[PDB]
Design a protein around this nucleic acid. Structure first.
Ligand code: MG
Ligand code: MG
Ligand code: MG
Ligand code: MG
Ligand code: MG
Ligand code: MG
Ligand code: MG
Ligand code: MG
Ligand code: MG
Ligand code: MG
Ligand code: MG
Ligand code: MG
Ligand code: MG
Ligand code: MG
Ligand code: MG
Ligand code: MG
Ligand code: MG
Ligand code: MG
Ligand code: MG
Ligand code: MG
Ligand code: MG
Ligand code: MG
Ligand code: MG
Ligand code: MG
Ligand code: MG
Ligand code: MG
Ligand code: MG
Ligand code: MG
Ligand code: MG
Ligand code: MG
Ligand code: MG
Ligand code: MG
Ligand code: MG
Ligand code: MG
Ligand code: MG
Ligand code: MG
Ligand code: MG
Ligand code: MG
Ligand code: MG
Ligand code: MG
Ligand code: MG
Ligand code: MG
Ligand code: MG
Ligand code: MG
Ligand code: MG
Ligand code: MG
Ligand code: MG
Ligand code: MG
Ligand code: MG
Ligand code: MG
Ligand code: MG
Ligand code: MG
Lengths: 56, 114, 123, 118, 186
RNA sequence: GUCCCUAUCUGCCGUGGGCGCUGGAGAACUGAGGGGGGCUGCUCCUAGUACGAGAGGACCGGAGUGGACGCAUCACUGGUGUUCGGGUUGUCAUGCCAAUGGCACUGCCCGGUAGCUAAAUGCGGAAGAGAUAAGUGCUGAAAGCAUCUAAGCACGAAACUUGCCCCGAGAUGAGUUCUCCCUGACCCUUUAAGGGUCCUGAAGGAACGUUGAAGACGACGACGUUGAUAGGCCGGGUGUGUAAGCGCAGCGAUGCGUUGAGCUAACCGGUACUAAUGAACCGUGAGGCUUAACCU
RNA sequence: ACGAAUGGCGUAAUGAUGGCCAGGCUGUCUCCACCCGAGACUCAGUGAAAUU
RNA sequence: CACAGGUGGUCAGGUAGAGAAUACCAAGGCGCUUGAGAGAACUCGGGUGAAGGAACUAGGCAAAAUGGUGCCGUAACUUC
RNA sequence: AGGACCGAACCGACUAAUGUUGAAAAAUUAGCGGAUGACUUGUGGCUGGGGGUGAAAGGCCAAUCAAACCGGGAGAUAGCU
């Protein structure tokens, strides 16, 4: 089954009204390195909760 | 949980004899006709044992009048007055369901001689 | 747990050996007949010199089933085969003079005291 | 419905799952830290830690169970000679799962899983 | 009559001395504490609000804590209301326990049934004008909803261990909340 | 015309996001309204009674048990249970023996935990109330009577509204109750429900994490160290059925002992060992006008 | 009523040929239940179509 | 189309097997150019199934079942 | 010996399901038929459109066939849209 009428740009926008991405609420800051990171994720320099968990 | 266990613990029989599949047992069951209550004996081969505490059960198979009859007893039911092991069987399975295809010569069970 | 087309052995000496359930009596759209239930059958196999003859249509009461019967304590009795006892169409009384194999306490009703009396065992 | 059921299917059949976790347990034992997806790490806990517990008691039969599992004498030897005694006092929780972002190729949630005493 | 809030502990059996096995659902009905009494004057209807169980002191939100503190009761794991018949009255803070059922022969038990998720028509409805009428039986969410089962026989009220044994099955999984009311059909 | 349909629209079944509901928030409700449900057989007492020359046989009411259907559940009986145990064929591998693993539809099978589940087992249909239908009536004139009707009054069915169950305040007519939180300063101008800066950021929420008998995803629930939320661990249970190794018997297959052994998923009871991080984020700073009443 | 090389009547054997019956077997069904996979669903990347 | 298609000849290891079937392997070559999760309905391909056993249906369609070797034994009919 | 039997390669295509904006303008999967023959197959050759070829189906003759394809008559004709 297929449309009989071209849906409008209005309806396209209404359907896409729920497509918006949600930005990360806020980043965590490691107490030792001071790097920002996703909460519960290790930092880019391999820190987590003030611990060098992975070397390099 | 603990509550269910204590409730079951206040109902399990304490004098349950130990039997294994392949044993021949005689189960005395309470039978009530009218108002007269009496014991009927069911003797056969234990072919399955379900150990679930209060919900324990065991299946006994006998061939009465050329008909194979399986009766599953609820081990802790008061209707089961007594269980007596008449013969120790020597099998290797927990469930002897293959005995349903066995007749006469094929259904003998080796004695557990110890 | 007998339904239409089920083949049943006969537990009596009325002459029939195998019957097929042709209708489960006792209620509209009733599906299964257990131990103690009445069914119309047709005779499929009978002895040549018997009181009933192949193709006879008459009622019967189911006395043994593989599906089994449950007892109030949860226990269950199971048989190797499905067995019935022939009844007359109108009197609904047994036609044979003996019952072979055990029957159950579930027939202990005023309608079926004959079968309990004639039963070698009433489990 | 999957009420009370456990164990992730991981879009694999049973034999593939078993083989993959055998391999992954071997990698975790020999390297002591591996980078895998978060669900695989979580299921890997349930495969590796029982191996270590088994390795706690050193016997021929235990080594043959740890070999029937993991199918590797390198890994069995390391288990029973290093990880068993290293974790002899620790009651469970031999592994540590560290979430580490997302895989570039497919945006999978990645996680480091490592032995706790590494 | 009012009901009580309990917890579904699980199912078990009771063997009667004449050899009947009664499937029982064990309901742990611990003390229900009246947290609020509602009347016509202030509320337009008569009811009691009860709580039960215990709650994490650090997980009682401050509105909830104030509501329980007015009653002078300890925070429970929820609030439930029971409508009152005119002869019935209770006081805030008063505790109600399971021997309220000591003489009740049948009860109604309502709980949230197990959730079957998105269920098809076969499971959900036992399947085999220019429009569809409302209420058309279709696939959708099954279970996970309030369900009452009526006229369950009370097998045992054990006050000391806070137990109600009702004959038969009651809605919901083990550990779920149950509202047990004396049977309204009777 | 039939059947399909990668289903845009209508319809429908479910389930969310937004904003609203006039300070915000957490709950508990009310109930406008809507939906579901409403079936039936048999047996037994009344009662072999009334009736009928007999034969035959009630109305009414009462009591249990079935069917069909529905709702729930998994204690039982079972099914499933490619995540548990075992047997076994062919082959390959782990150096070899032994022991194991892979592959052959889960290789083929035998059992079976949890969960799910029916065939399993609990429960339901109602009672009651209100107003009625056909119909039965009371009184009563028109029409000196008669008349159930004109005034009035009483009954009257699974029909209607209730009563039972569920949804339900977006019921915009946006309701009620309880509780909780916020009690700074200043500037500007088209001076108003105005804008702005600084300080402040509550209750709570959200997010993240561990997850769930919740679940397509959202959602909903539990928990986040002051912790049993999940995994592991310990003990048990359960299942399977006497592991391996060793010893003995045997020529050997194999048997016996150690040994109801070893192993054992989702189960139970525990246990902080691992992971649930301090924070940060959103949400503000007493809540318009008019009029009535009351405290003063 | 067809009908005798537009062949009539038979015929062992043969047939992925038409019709029927029996045994066995069974989820074809009563009446579905559970499970294992591949999609469906969510996330990331790429990204059509009929129709209008 | 980097397309489940088509395309002649040659070579022919081991174990089991009658076999160039089939299973598992060698030599050798590959994991098929989207992944990651989840574990709804439903679709597709499978496994199992109580009691019944074709009651399904247009129709046993589909499925299930039979299946090997040796020895015995083997009907009507027959053009032998 | 055999247009013998069972059965792979090989040739086919009976059933069902899937697919049916396909993986595919005819397949896949599971079954199925033939499988020393009137078999099958490579290479090359020949037969040409009112013609060929056809164990014959109006089949096939380059995914096209109750008369191929291409160019021309040709802007055929169309009281029809
Ligand atoms: Mg159109
Ligand atoms: Mg979208
Ligand atoms: Mg779990
Ligand atoms: Mg995938
Ligand atoms: Mg395999
Ligand atoms: Mg669920
Ligand atoms: Mg049609
Ligand atoms: Mg569709
Ligand atoms: Mg209705
Ligand atoms: Mg259970
Ligand atoms: Mg079972
Ligand atoms: Mg199995
Ligand atoms: Mg196994
Ligand atoms: Mg060996
Ligand atoms: Mg291999
Ligand atoms: Mg292979
Ligand atoms: Mg009434
Ligand atoms: Mg008058
Ligand atoms: Mg009504
Ligand atoms: Mg834990
Ligand atoms: Mg055990
Ligand atoms: Mg072994
Ligand atoms: Mg001819
Ligand atoms: Mg059907
Ligand atoms: Mg996408
Ligand atoms: Mg386009
Ligand atoms: Mg490719
Ligand atoms: Mg190709
Ligand atoms: Mg070829
Ligand atoms: Mg091959
Ligand atoms: Mg699936
Ligand atoms: Mg399927
Ligand atoms: Mg099958
Ligand atoms: Mg079956
Ligand atoms: Mg069977
Ligand atoms: Mg049969
Ligand atoms: Mg038929
Ligand atoms: Mg037939
Ligand atoms: Mg039919
Ligand atoms: Mg077929
Ligand atoms: Mg098959
Ligand atoms: Mg031939
Ligand atoms: Mg051809
Ligand atoms: Mg299909
Ligand atoms: Mg094929
Ligand atoms: Mg042939
Ligand atoms: Mg052949
Ligand atoms: Mg033609
Ligand atoms: Mg062509
Ligand atoms: Mg022409
Ligand atoms: Mg011209
Ligand atoms: Mg032209």
């Amino acid at each position: 089954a297929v449309q009989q009428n071209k849906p409008t740009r209005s309806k396209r926008g209404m359907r896409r009204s729920h497509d918006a991405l949600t930005a990360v609420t806020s980043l965590s800051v490691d107490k030792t390195s001071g790097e920002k990171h996703l909460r519960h994720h290790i930092t880019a320099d391999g820190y987590y909760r003030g611990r060098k968990v992975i070397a390099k | 949980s603990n509550i269910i266990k204590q409730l079951e613990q206040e109902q399990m029989k304490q004098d349950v004899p130990s039997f294994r599949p392949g044993d021949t047992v005689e189960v005395k069951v309470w039978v009530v006709e009218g108002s007269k209550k009496r014991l009927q004996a069911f003797e056969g081969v234990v072919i399955a044992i379900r150990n679930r505490g209060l919900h324990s059960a065991f299946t006994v198979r006998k061939i009465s009048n050329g008909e194979g009859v399986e009766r599953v007893f609820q081990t802790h039911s008061p209707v089961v007055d007594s269980i007596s092991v008449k013969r120790r069987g020597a099998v290797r399975k927990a469930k002897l369901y293959y005995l349903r295809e066995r007749t006469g010569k094929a259904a003998r069970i080796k004695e557990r001689l110890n | 747990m007998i339904q239409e087309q089920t083949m049943l052995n006969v537990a009596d000496n009325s002459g029939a050996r195998r019957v097929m359930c042709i209708k489960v009596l006792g209620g509209s759209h009733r599906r299964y007949a257990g131990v103690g239930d009445i069914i119309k059958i047709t005779i499929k196999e009978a002895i040549p010199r018997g009181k009933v003859k192949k193709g006879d249509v008459l009622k019967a009461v189911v006395v043994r089933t593989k599906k089994g019967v449950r007892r109030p304590d949860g226990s269950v009795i199971r048989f190797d085969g499905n067995a019935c006892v022939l009844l007359n169409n109108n009197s609904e009384q047994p036609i044979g003079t003996r019952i072979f194999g055990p029957v159950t306490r579930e027939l202990r009703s005023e309608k079926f005291m004959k079968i309990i009396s004639l039963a070698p065992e009433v489990l | 419905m999957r009420h009370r059921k456990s164990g992730r299917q991981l879009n694999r059949n049973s034999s593939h799952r078993q083989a993959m976790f055998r391999n992954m347990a071997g990698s975790l034992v020999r390297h002591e830290i591996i980078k895998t997806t978060l669900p695989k790490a979580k299921e890997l806990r349930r495969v590796v830690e029982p191996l270590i517990t088994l390795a706690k008691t050193d016997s021929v039969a235990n080594r043959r169970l740890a070999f029937a599992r993991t199918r590797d004498n390198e890994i069995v030897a390391k288990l029973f000679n290093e990880l068993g005694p290293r974790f002899a006092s620790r009651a469970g929780g031999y592994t540590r799962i560290l979430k580490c972002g997302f895989r570039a190729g497919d945006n999978a949630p990645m996680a480091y899983i490592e032995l706790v005493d590494r | 009559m009012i009901g009580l809030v309990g917890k579904k502990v699980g199912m078990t059996r009771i063997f009667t001395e004449d050899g009947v096995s009664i499937p029982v659902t064990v309901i742990e009905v611990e003390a229900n504490r009246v947290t609020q009494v509602k009347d016509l004057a202030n509320d337009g209807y008569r009811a009691i609000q009860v709580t039960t169980g215990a709650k994490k002191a650090n997980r009682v939100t401050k509105p909830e804590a104030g509501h329980f503190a007015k009653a002078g009761v300890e925070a429970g794991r929820g609030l439930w209301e029971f409508r009152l018949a005119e002869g019935e009255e209770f006081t805030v803070g008063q505790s109600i326990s399971v021997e309220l059922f000591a003489d009740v022969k049948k009860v109604d038990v309502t709980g949230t049934s197990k959730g079957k998720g998105f269920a098809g028509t076969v499971k959900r409805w036992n399947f085999r004008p220019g429009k569809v009428f409302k209420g058309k039986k279709m696939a959708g969410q099954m279970g996970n909803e309030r369900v009452t089962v009526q006229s369950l026989d009370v097998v045992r009220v054990d006050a000391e261990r806070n137990l109600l044994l009702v004959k038969g099955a009651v809605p919901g999984a083990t550990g779920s909340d149950l509202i047990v009311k004396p049977a309204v059909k009777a």
